[model samples]
Target: AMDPSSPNYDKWEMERTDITMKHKLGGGQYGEVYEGVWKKYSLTVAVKTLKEDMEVEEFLKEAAVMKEIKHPNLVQLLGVCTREPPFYIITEFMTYGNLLDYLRECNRQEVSAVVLLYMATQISSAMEYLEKKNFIHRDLAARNCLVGENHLVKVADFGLSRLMTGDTYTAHAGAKFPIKWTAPESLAYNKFSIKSDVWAFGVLLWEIATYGMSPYPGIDLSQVYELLEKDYRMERPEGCPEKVYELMRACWQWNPSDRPSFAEIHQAFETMFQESSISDEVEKEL
Candidate 1:
């Protein structure tokens, strides 16, 4: 499904020496992600290393795909280092890091409601773009989204996402399903569509509202399915607006068809954003 010579190495692959790995941001089953500097370009980037050679083909395919897909709220896949060992996939550096940690570290004690809503709006905007492009992000969660300067939020971690050749995607195989954040259909059948991502977005919104509290704090993973079947949605956070919580409920609708599309979600959030913007302005004037 991939061609060695079909790809333009010059465009996708970079010299290993050009990027200097800095501090480690995080490490996962795949490999460690570091804050690195691209000396030739003189720009900082999020450098993700590949541990296994098995990862090379798929990531290169993703990097090539990423080059064509660009959105303001979507993380940029800058390039890669595929010539030899210690493979690297570099992306535009996000200064503030992942949204989950960023929210936990600096709750609303300093960040305002307007700022919170704006970040959620940006995430929806990114998903809306990806949805329009026919890609289903199987791993859409708050931790997967990155925060940049000026509180810029970008949807990232495409390793689990697949280009929707048809209408839906099924998992290859993974013991670790996104139990807490997954839609019912996705949990039951391992199937994914843009609708499932919408479901995950609702969970991410809860994360934003509760200042990064884990969903279903005391519940078992096996129970989420039956609970959702019984229409047991998460309660609104203490300070979460009625309107925002309503939107979250809308996304959690059991039937995927019944859930609002990402386009609708983005529009609804944008409406709230502008109204909040006006309210903030009035508050300043007072």
Candidate 2:
């Protein structure tokens, strides 16, 4: 069943003996993930170990797709192990794990306004890359993103939906999406597009602003769509810059066409990053 799509595929089938699991990093349904080392590369990596219940065709299919797409902020799919039962989808290990927890767990002074703004820019930059490639990240929440060393953040859990059950709050018909991060159209029509991703980006930016507070703090999941249908959008997160709130508001527009493109969002956020003055002020602030 394995049709070699690229020259890399044969080589991409990673050696089983090379992996050495270090510790678990709180994974959900599909399987538990780990911080491990690849003996071949002799490098530390994040190993996504698929549970026995998942299938193979989709796993290898995802491996083939991840091999082509490349980006600085997008997690690089290091390799795959489909020859046996305990399949491993390896990628560069982000030291801090997901952005959601990092924002909440880290000391307030450690991730001040400037660094938070910088993180938003990096995610927006990565989202723009996906937009250009016509790859919808379908899932793009802070929990899905990774925070690496030295304030470097990378987007993970894209293009491998079947392989990952995610922090999928609800599963309707393979419900891999959450009502809070999903756009109204996506939730209603089961239609996902770049615009829907942008809508999720709005939610993610809010996470950054609020130090990873769960979205719709006061509302229930079942009621989220009902409220959105009634034009019930979330309020501006306290202490979030007015411009950033505007960006978040733009993404939640009822009409998909009204949502800002990732390119536009990235460009605007880049200015926010610049305005935050990470160079001189960062040392003083953090």
Candidate 3:
């Protein structure tokens, strides 16, 4: 919730009368997303409507948190239309939509290993930003990240994110969570930490390597825990660079502390980019 008189309040407040929904784009558990226009600025935006039954207070609080976060690799919140029912949270429209679908639909010839690595680096940068802000993105997967113009990848879908009260967060028992992308500790005990996010980033890297292939390949959910207990991990995807695979392995370490921080992961990718023979112009396309 935000106070109307606050100086920054108006900056994020949009009049309902000024918005026009162009079409429905997509929908999630919370609500539907539509391509919309804000009449005041003549701006094209993505308007996300909250479900009618959801409590507005929590979502508004989340929106307020989102308003202050600005990063090139992170989705930007433009404004909010919360004065009435069917609340809309406006953000910059991502032309290509989710990274998973984008990658799955593109040919290998169109998106090379360098481009994939660039996307992974951008995600790492965004995760590093969240880590610094003490925000935990409990859900970090290819489907949650959006692909924008110029192949820019922006981390989105903060429905499962939260401001960390301490170094760790515990989820209530039996709460729904992504099994394949979750860390062993989190899956077993519902405890979450930055390390848990790091683990998911590893899974995300795997997804990038496989061009949106589901994690764990042919393994069944019932067997995944026992397999993981035996220190088994997913095999590297075909054509995945050995170096990148090694980084992914590091992230899945049995001890969370042994995993690389997002900063470290970013630095590793930066080093790889610098040492590669890829041309500056090609790299700039990301």
Which candidate achieves the best TM-score against the true structure? 3
Worst 10 residues of 1 by lDDT: 163-172
- Stretches of candidate 1 off by over 4 Å are 1-9, 27-30, 83-86, 158-174, 276-286
Clashing pairs in 2: none
| Clashes by residue pair, model 1 | none
- Which parts of model 2 are misplaced by more than 4 Å? 1-9, 27-30, 83-86, 158-168, 171-176, 273-286
lDDT of 2 by residue, 9-66 (tens): 5666777788988887555422467778887677998777655573567777777778
Q: Per-model C-alpha lDDT, please?
A: 0.79, 0.80, 0.81
Estimated TM-score for each candidate: 0.84, 0.85, 0.86
Model 3 C-alpha lDDT per residue in residues 39-157, reported as the tens digit of each score: 88888888877755845787788788888799999999988877667778889988888898899998778688778888999999999999889888888998789997777999997
Candidate 2 lDDT score relative to the true structure:
0.80
Give a tens-digit lDDT track for model 1, residues 1-286: 0235655436667777888888776543124678888998889988877655365777667767777789999999788776667777888988877788899997554577778888899999989998999988878887788888878899887353342232123343565455788888987787789999999999999998887888888887757789999999898777677778889999999989999999999999878656456335424433
Q: Which of 2 and 3 is ahead in lDDT? A: 3
lDDT of 3 at 14: 73
Could you give the candidate ranking by TM-score, starting with the highest?
A: 3, 2, 1
